[PDB]
Amino acid sequence: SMNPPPPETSNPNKPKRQTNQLQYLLRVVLKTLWKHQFAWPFQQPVDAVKLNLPDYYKIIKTPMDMGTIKKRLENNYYWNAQECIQDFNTMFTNCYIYNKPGDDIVLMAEALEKLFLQKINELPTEE
Amino acid sequence: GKGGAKR
Ligand code: NA
Ligand code: NA
């Protein structure tokens, strides 16, 4: 069994930017979720080999995780906040697609997502 | 799915 290559965290052709909102996404939003007790299943790409999930990457064709997001933000990989928010949304959605209600992983995703939504509700302006 | 107990 094999994992796919992980999502890129750097791309020498992709224009780079740090906006006040992107700074907030790294320093407040990602930081708060990263430290959370439920963060660990989301801190790296799903290892379908190690977790013996041979259908994982049959079902999930746009994988995303907070490790990837963290490195993207550290590398100024994004042009804007919305790209980064989309990646978080994709991570949560994948989890809900692949798993079932009542599964701990789903309960975990939901608590992180509620916190994520709370934090992004107060994105700063480029003030 | 990843049904295992995690919490
Ligand atoms: Na790539
Ligand atoms: Na700032």
Author numbering:
A (entry chain A): 42 to 168
B (entry chain B): 11 to 17
Paper text:
Bromodomains (BRDs) are protein interaction modules that specifically recognize ε-N-lysine acetylation motifs, a key event in the reading process of epigenetic marks. Despite large sequence variations, all BRD modules share a conserved fold that comprises a left-handed bundle of four α helices (αZ, αA, αB, αC), linked by loop regions of variable length (ZA and BC loops), which line the Kac binding site and determine binding specificity.
ITC data collected on the first BRD of BRD4 showed a 30-fold increase in affinity between the singly acetylated peptide H4K5ac to the most optimal wild-type peptide H4K5acK8ac.
